[PDB]
Enzyme design. Structure first.
Site, PDB file in Angstrom:
ATOM      1  N   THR A  53      -4.552  42.380  32.774  1.00 30.64           N
ATOM      2  CA  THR A  53      -4.909  43.743  32.421  1.00 30.64           C
ATOM      3  C   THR A  53      -5.818  43.724  31.203  1.00 30.64           C
ATOM      4  O   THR A  53      -5.632  42.903  30.291  1.00 30.64           O
ATOM      5  CB  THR A  53      -3.660  44.576  32.130  1.00 30.64           C
ATOM      6  OG1 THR A  53      -2.727  44.454  33.199  1.00 30.64           O
ATOM      7  CG2 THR A  53      -3.996  46.059  31.995  1.00 30.64           C
ATOM      8  N   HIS A  68      -3.089  26.894  29.500  1.00 29.43           N
ATOM      9  CA  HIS A  68      -4.019  27.018  28.386  1.00 29.43           C
ATOM     10  C   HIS A  68      -3.966  25.818  27.457  1.00 29.43           C
ATOM     11  O   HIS A  68      -4.990  25.417  26.895  1.00 29.43           O
ATOM     12  CB  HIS A  68      -3.699  28.275  27.609  1.00 29.43           C
ATOM     13  CG  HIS A  68      -4.134  29.528  28.286  1.00 29.43           C
ATOM     14  ND1 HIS A  68      -4.439  30.678  27.590  1.00 29.43           N
ATOM     15  CD2 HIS A  68      -4.290  29.828  29.600  1.00 29.43           C
ATOM     16  CE1 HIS A  68      -4.791  31.624  28.443  1.00 29.43           C
ATOM     17  NE2 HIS A  68      -4.708  31.134  29.669  1.00 29.43           N
ATOM     18  N   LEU A 128      -0.038  48.794  21.129  1.00 30.69           N
ATOM     19  CA  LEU A 128      -0.451  49.621  22.228  1.00 30.69           C
ATOM     20  C   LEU A 128      -1.808  49.184  22.702  1.00 30.69           C
ATOM     21  O   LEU A 128      -2.800  49.756  22.417  1.00 30.69           O
ATOM     22  CB  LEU A 128      -0.424  51.116  21.854  1.00 30.69           C
ATOM     23  CG  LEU A 128      -0.848  52.088  22.942  1.00 30.69           C
ATOM     24  CD1 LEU A 128       0.134  52.080  24.063  1.00 30.69           C
ATOM     25  CD2 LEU A 128      -0.889  53.485  22.389  1.00 30.69           C
ATOM     26  N   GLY A 129      -1.767  48.125  23.474  1.00 33.71           N
ATOM     27  CA  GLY A 129      -2.913  47.520  24.064  1.00 33.71           C
ATOM     28  C   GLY A 129      -2.879  47.532  25.582  1.00 33.71           C
ATOM     29  O   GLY A 129      -2.196  48.281  26.114  1.00 33.71           O
ATOM     30  N   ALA A 130      -3.589  46.615  26.197  1.00 43.02           N
ATOM     31  CA  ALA A 130      -3.656  46.591  27.647  1.00 43.02           C
ATOM     32  C   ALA A 130      -2.280  46.389  28.298  1.00 43.02           C
ATOM     33  O   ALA A 130      -1.935  47.078  29.186  1.00 43.02           O
ATOM     34  CB  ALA A 130      -4.563  45.477  28.067  1.00 43.02           C
ATOM     35  N   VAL A 131      -1.531  45.423  27.789  1.00 43.54           N
ATOM     36  CA  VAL A 131      -0.180  45.185  28.314  1.00 43.54           C
ATOM     37  C   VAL A 131       0.673  46.446  28.210  1.00 43.54           C
ATOM     38  O   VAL A 131       1.362  46.846  29.154  1.00 43.54           O
ATOM     39  CB  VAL A 131       0.462  44.007  27.564  1.00 43.54           C
ATOM     40  CG1 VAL A 131       1.948  43.980  27.796  1.00 43.54           C
ATOM     41  CG2 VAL A 131      -0.207  42.713  27.962  1.00 43.54           C
ATOM     42  N   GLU A 190      -4.014  31.905  19.894  1.00 46.25           N
ATOM     43  CA  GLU A 190      -2.636  32.156  20.294  1.00 46.25           C
ATOM     44  C   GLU A 190      -2.031  30.933  20.975  1.00 46.25           C
ATOM     45  O   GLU A 190      -0.879  30.568  20.717  1.00 46.25           O
ATOM     46  CB  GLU A 190      -2.543  33.370  21.234  1.00 46.25           C
ATOM     47  CG  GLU A 190      -1.083  33.673  21.599  1.00 46.25           C
ATOM     48  CD  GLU A 190      -0.915  34.923  22.482  1.00 46.25           C
ATOM     49  OE1 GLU A 190       0.183  35.120  23.053  1.00 46.25           O
ATOM     50  OE2 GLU A 190      -1.876  35.725  22.598  1.00 46.25           O
TER      51      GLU A 190
HETATM   52  N1  LIG Z   1      -3.618  41.383  28.988  1.00 43.33           N
HETATM   53  C1  LIG Z   1      -3.268  40.264  29.838  1.00 43.33           C
HETATM   54  O1  LIG Z   1      -3.640  40.251  30.988  1.00 43.33           O
HETATM   55  C2  LIG Z   1      -2.403  39.135  29.293  1.00 43.33           C
HETATM   56  C3  LIG Z   1      -2.359  37.971  30.002  1.00 43.33           C
HETATM   57  C4  LIG Z   1      -1.577  36.948  29.572  1.00 43.33           C
HETATM   58  C5  LIG Z   1      -0.829  37.074  28.415  1.00 43.33           C
HETATM   59  N2  LIG Z   1      -0.870  38.226  27.695  1.00 43.33           N
HETATM   60  C6  LIG Z   1      -0.046  38.271  26.495  1.00 43.33           C
HETATM   61  O2  LIG Z   1       0.118  39.794  26.010  1.00 43.33           O
HETATM   62  C7  LIG Z   1      -0.299  39.857  24.743  1.00 43.33           C
HETATM   63  C8  LIG Z   1      -0.980  41.209  24.424  1.00 43.33           C
HETATM   64  O3  LIG Z   1      -2.063  41.220  25.328  1.00 43.33           O
HETATM   65  P1  LIG Z   1      -3.028  42.547  25.340  1.00 43.33           P
HETATM   66  O4  LIG Z   1      -4.117  42.312  26.382  1.00 43.33           O
HETATM   67  O5  LIG Z   1      -2.254  43.810  25.463  1.00 43.33           O
HETATM   68  O6  LIG Z   1      -3.824  42.461  23.922  1.00 43.33           O
HETATM   69  P2  LIG Z   1      -4.516  43.698  23.091  1.00 43.33           P
HETATM   70  O7  LIG Z   1      -5.979  44.025  23.077  1.00 43.33           O
HETATM   71  O8  LIG Z   1      -4.683  42.754  21.901  1.00 43.33           O
HETATM   72  O9  LIG Z   1      -3.333  44.710  22.531  1.00 43.33           O
HETATM   73  C9  LIG Z   1      -2.414  44.135  21.615  1.00 43.33           C
HETATM   74  C10 LIG Z   1      -1.916  45.284  20.690  1.00 43.33           C
HETATM   75  O10 LIG Z   1      -1.208  44.763  19.705  1.00 43.33           O
HETATM   76  C11 LIG Z   1      -1.963  45.018  18.336  1.00 43.33           C
HETATM   77  N3  LIG Z   1      -1.949  43.734  17.605  1.00 43.33           N
HETATM   78  C12 LIG Z   1      -2.688  42.621  17.746  1.00 43.33           C
HETATM   79  N4  LIG Z   1      -2.340  41.730  16.801  1.00 43.33           N
HETATM   80  C13 LIG Z   1      -1.337  42.295  16.089  1.00 43.33           C
HETATM   81  C14 LIG Z   1      -0.625  41.836  15.030  1.00 43.33           C
HETATM   82  N5  LIG Z   1      -0.778  40.521  14.415  1.00 43.33           N
HETATM   83  N6  LIG Z   1       0.317  42.577  14.449  1.00 43.33           N
HETATM   84  C15 LIG Z   1       0.567  43.821  14.946  1.00 43.33           C
HETATM   85  N7  LIG Z   1      -0.150  44.273  15.999  1.00 43.33           N
HETATM   86  C16 LIG Z   1      -1.101  43.517  16.573  1.00 43.33           C
HETATM   87  C17 LIG Z   1      -3.187  45.350  18.714  1.00 43.33           C
HETATM   88  O11 LIG Z   1      -3.813  46.362  17.807  1.00 43.33           O
HETATM   89  P3  LIG Z   1      -5.120  45.812  16.982  1.00 43.33           P
HETATM   90  O12 LIG Z   1      -6.181  45.395  17.956  1.00 43.33           O
HETATM   91  O13 LIG Z   1      -5.585  46.935  16.097  1.00 43.33           O
HETATM   92  O14 LIG Z   1      -4.651  44.646  16.153  1.00 43.33           O
HETATM   93  C18 LIG Z   1      -3.123  46.023  20.115  1.00 43.33           C
HETATM   94  O15 LIG Z   1      -2.889  47.370  20.046  1.00 43.33           O
HETATM   95  C19 LIG Z   1      -1.367  38.714  24.644  1.00 43.33           C
HETATM   96  O16 LIG Z   1      -1.608  38.375  23.360  1.00 43.33           O
HETATM   97  C20 LIG Z   1      -0.575  37.658  25.458  1.00 43.33           C
HETATM   98  O17 LIG Z   1       0.532  37.246  24.519  1.00 43.33           O
HETATM   99  C21 LIG Z   1      -1.629  39.275  28.134  1.00 43.33           C
HETATM  100  N1  LIG Z   2      -4.497  33.663  33.467  1.00 44.49           N
HETATM  101  C1  LIG Z   2      -3.170  33.135  33.748  1.00 44.49           C
HETATM  102  C2  LIG Z   2      -3.165  31.639  33.425  1.00 44.49           C
HETATM  103  C3  LIG Z   2      -3.206  30.916  34.771  1.00 44.49           C
HETATM  104  N2  LIG Z   2      -4.574  30.935  35.269  1.00 44.49           N
HETATM  105  C4  LIG Z   2      -4.575  30.644  36.676  1.00 44.49           C
HETATM  106  C5  LIG Z   2      -5.950  30.183  37.155  1.00 44.49           C
HETATM  107  C6  LIG Z   2      -6.949  31.311  37.203  1.00 44.49           C
HETATM  108  C7  LIG Z   2      -6.761  32.589  36.720  1.00 44.49           C
HETATM  109  N3  LIG Z   2      -7.881  33.247  36.954  1.00 44.49           N
HETATM  110  C8  LIG Z   2      -8.732  32.424  37.557  1.00 44.49           C
HETATM  111  N4  LIG Z   2      -8.168  31.238  37.717  1.00 44.49           N
HETATM  112  C9  LIG Z   2      -3.764  29.386  36.968  1.00 44.49           C
HETATM  113  O1  LIG Z   2      -3.882  28.484  36.122  1.00 44.49           O
HETATM  114  O2  LIG Z   2      -3.067  29.243  38.005  1.00 44.49           O
HETATM  115  C10 LIG Z   2      -2.066  33.849  32.989  1.00 44.49           C
HETATM  116  O3  LIG Z   2      -1.712  33.501  31.828  1.00 44.49           O
HETATM  117  O4  LIG Z   2      -1.495  34.805  33.559  1.00 44.49           O
HETATM  118  O1  LIG Z   3      -6.455  34.892  33.464  1.00 48.62           O
HETATM  119  C1  LIG Z   3      -7.497  34.822  32.749  1.00 48.62           C
HETATM  120  O2  LIG Z   3      -8.563  35.367  33.155  1.00 48.62           O
HETATM  121  C2  LIG Z   3      -7.492  34.109  31.398  1.00 48.62           C
HETATM  122  C3  LIG Z   3      -6.294  33.181  31.270  1.00 48.62           C
HETATM  123  C4  LIG Z   3      -5.037  33.900  30.755  1.00 48.62           C
HETATM  124  O3  LIG Z   3      -3.974  33.576  31.186  1.00 48.62           O
HETATM  125  C5  LIG Z   3      -5.034  34.992  29.686  1.00 48.62           C
HETATM  126  O4  LIG Z   3      -5.741  36.040  29.766  1.00 48.62           O
HETATM  127  O5  LIG Z   3      -4.271  34.831  28.702  1.00 48.62           O
END
Ligand SMILES: NC(=O)c1ccc[n+]([C@@H]2O[C@H](COP(=O)([O-])OP(=O)(O)OC[C@H]3O[C@@H](n4cnc5c(N)ncnc54)[C@H](OP(=O)(O)O)[C@@H]3O)[C@@H](O)[C@H]2O)c1
Ligand SMILES: N[C@@H](CCN[C@@H](Cc1cnc[nH]1)C(=O)O)C(=O)O
Ligand SMILES: O=C(O)CCC(=O)C(=O)O
Ligand SMILES: NC(=O)c1ccc[n+]([C@@H]2O[C@H](COP(=O)([O-])OP(=O)(O)OC[C@H]3O[C@@H](n4cnc5c(N)ncnc54)[C@H](OP(=O)(O)O)[C@@H]3O)[C@@H](O)[C@H]2O)c1
Lengths: 425, 423
Positions: free
Chosen positions: A148, A213, A10-13, A358
């Protein structure tokens, strides 16, 4: 339908997904998060009557809303068989741990499991970990559909969405899966177009972070910033010397895209046009920088032109060209996202940020999988070795005793073997 | 060897040159500045005891110094035959007019004429206006060797040099005075490279290659001709500035055209990328590898365009500037466009960028026609400027526009250059 939905992590996503799920409706909404400071804060917030809050930034302000959570668990022992849909909102490099850890004996009614940010092989890996005879369909979403963040960890239930993708892709372990359309509708509520594809790996092959990445944040420049303590953190999407983007990084991006495309073909999935994917699905630039004919023709353009076009694309996005100009003709500094750096945890051990830990763990698994298809992936291996060397030197300097074991050599061959066996069955 | 030196055009360039001449050693120093308000201010300042005053900014503060002006003229007919060396410090578009105006039949003592910002053909054009048997050697410098300006036109003879170039080139109408002028200018810190013909030096003028594709295009002209809105930036990428892959393609194609013209005039052309990196502002090996720089002329058009684009992207900030606390480097590319302005008579004028650049390229194209070179890229850039300025005149009214905006014909000058070259 979706029935009762359990958010795992339960995080940002999860908060964005929760808003979209509540708009769609039809069931109880629960969440499971493993014990720790965040879960303690979450339970405290919920116990005083707080709800999930999603705010949209700038043009996305229309998204903003609140979502109620019916139950929150930080102890899987309290889960009972009340859930039809599981949504994995944890980091993608934890999917295996998380799926193994769920109390599947009390989750027999689960019919679908959604991986919100899948990578090539993730669907198969998760299926390999399910109990025998589990009849849950596993869905792979290509990429998380927004950007997010939890603004203030002191208010763990309030998140900010600053960007939303134009398009993402969705595959399912079940052929002609009807759940894909349900999720199309759920995400359409936030303006994202979900395109259903015929297999999970076709969707996983469209995970944006794998392509971006890997070449940019596993290289020497990024790792020097991420592993630094003193000095400026630098910027993730700027050109050298402010950020990691160089012609060599762009060449690595092209060559990795070629390697990943061949892996996809060997798994029966159609590769993507990298430039068109980046421009049309994620963030665009003007025709004068990237002509439509160049975008559409990218895959037949030849390596030199491909690299030139990719470089232009990232240089064109150093500012947001569609942002309003200010009084002096300048546009928003879209590329100034600072690198997150190593930090000490509560036990005093150095931890790596998600970027790149990651990203490394994902690519390491993909490379190990590709070996089963007799694909060596030299560019991918060069990026892995760059990360490994940099982190190894950090451990040398800081001392093993001061470093969390996640910094250490990881063996991806067992998971890759499980994936390949699942694919062959 | 320099003798008495007459500076023609007593502005910023002339003041820097005067102090370099004085460091080296020269005879009397005179100047010729044509009538106008500037000459009125100069004459009054001289009457109240002014001298030529050069200030070096920052690291160039050792350049600072004063020099007396021994003679000031406004009327070329009043010149005495007391001058061994003339230095043309006027805009290059005026070189022919200046030379045609001088009473050469009574200036037999002139031995050397230095053109400080020589365009391709300038040496030949100047020589075509000289009387037969005229004894003067004509020297072509590739470009002015510093960045200098008169601080405040109310203290007319006080100039500020803020920067000095790394390298310039010097060619002469006489096979094998170059060495004297190499030493003179070397006192400022610039390296002067003598070359075997005038056109080899003229062909190493950087603005010819850079200002033409970037500042004669549609984006730049839209900023320059605009009155409201932000001016935009000369060296940023679209939409903040004019640099686009199309602009870089124009740059490459024009460099190819100019290079063939130079070859037809018996001059070895330049490697554009090496010239930009090594003579102007460098970038790091990770952005432009030395082997890519040195190999540019043989790399093939796609790679050449990619490399040029990388060069300008790499200089959006100065990568050798110190990082600030946020990891940012100096915003090198934020040079605002100068735009049209009304003059003292109320008439719209164009800034020197791009007026001077258009006039130079127009002459080059007219000259190239004599060598059976059509220069389609150059002609496209000329047309872009002409169409934009024409629409500005349509909108503002010809009666509101200075005549320098009106159509020009460089074919007579080109014919005179070609005839001199064939002589
Ligand atoms: N947010 C974005 O904009 C974004 C962008 C691109 C990709 N993603 C992908 O979405 C995934 C989650 O993103 P998020 O921003 O929601 O991250 P967040 O801050 O890390 O929330 C993730 C949730 O999962 C828990 N967690 C983390 N590691 C864990 C583990 N090994 N086992 C069980 N629970 C765990 C966390 O609790 P704890 O902190 O207590 O561990 C937290 O509640 C990212 O890792 C990535 O794969 C997100
Ligand atoms: N952050 C993305 C990864 C892709 N990043 C963007 C570039 C960018 C994002 N912000 C400022 N410049 C892209 O490469 O076209 C995701 O995983 O959703
Ligand atoms: O979009 C950003 O600001 C960072 C790059 C990304 O894709 C991420 O947050 O995992
Ligand atoms: N850093 C630099 O200064 C620099 C750098 C690169 C290139 N250049 C080029 O060098 C040329 C001279 O530069 P500058 O900065 O010294 O210009 P400036 O300060 O305006 O001086 C030009 C001087 O020459 C006078 N003049 C113009 N036409 C004349 C003519 N036909 N006969 C006699 N005198 C004449 C001018 O008087 P009026 O003002 O009354 O016309 C003025 O005093 C320019 O075209 C410039 O673009 C200069």
């Amino acid at each position: 339908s979706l029935g009762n939905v359990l958010l795992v992590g339960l995080g940002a996503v999860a908060i964005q997904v929760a808003l979209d799920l509540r708009r769609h409706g039809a069931g109880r909404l629960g969440a499971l998060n493993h014990p720790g400071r965040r879960s303690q804060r979450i339970a405290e917030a919920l116990a005083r009557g707080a709800c999930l809050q999603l705010e949209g930034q700038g043009q996305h302000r229309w998204l903003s809303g609140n979502a109620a959570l019916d139950v929150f668990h930080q102890d899987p022992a309290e889960l009972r068989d009340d859930w039809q849909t599981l949504v994995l909102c944890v980091p993608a490099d934890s999917y295996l741990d998380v799926v193994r850890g769920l109390p599947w004996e009390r989750l027999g009614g689960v019919r679908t499991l959604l991986l919100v940010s899948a990578f090539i092989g993730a669907n198969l890996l998760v299926r390999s970990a399910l109990p025998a005879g589990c009849q849950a369909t596993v869905l792979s979403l290509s990429s998380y559909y927004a950007a997010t963040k939890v603004i203030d960890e002191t208010q763990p239930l309030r998140a900010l969405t600053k960007a939303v993708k134009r398009r993402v892709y969705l595959g399912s372990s079940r052929p002609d899966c009807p759940a894909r359309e349900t999720w199309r509708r759920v995400l359409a509520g936030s303006g994202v177009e979900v395109v259903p594809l015929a297999t999970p790996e076709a969707a996983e092959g469209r995970n944006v972070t794998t392509y971006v990445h890997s070449p940019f944040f596993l290289g020497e420049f990024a790792l020097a910033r991420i592993l630094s303590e003193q000095g400026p953190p630098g910027f993730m999407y700027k050109l050298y010397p402010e950020g990691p983007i160089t012609p060599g990084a762009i060449g690595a991006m092209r060559r990795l895209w070629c390697e990943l495309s061949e892996l996809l073909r060997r798994m029966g999935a159609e590769p993507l046009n990298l430039l068109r994917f980046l421009n049309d699905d994620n963030y665009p630039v003007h025709e004068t920088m990237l002509p439509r004919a160049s975008i559409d023709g990218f895959a037949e353009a030849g390596a030199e032109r491909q690299e030139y076009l990719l470089f232009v694309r990232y240089a064109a996005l150093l500012v947001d060209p569609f942002s309003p100009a200010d009084e002096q003709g300048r546009h928003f500094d879209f590329s100034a996202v600072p690198f997150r750096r190593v930090s000490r945890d509560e036990d005093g051990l150095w931890r790596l940020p998600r970027v790149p830990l990651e990203d490394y763990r994902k690519l390491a698994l993909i490379v190990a999988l590709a070996a089963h298809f007799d694909l060596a992936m030299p560019q991918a291996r060069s990026l892995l070795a760059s990360y490994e060397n940099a982190v190894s030197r950090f451990i040398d300097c800081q001392g093993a005793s001061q470093c969390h074991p996640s910094l250490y050599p990881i063996d991806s061959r067992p998971a890759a073997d499980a994936i390949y066996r699942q694919w062959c069955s």
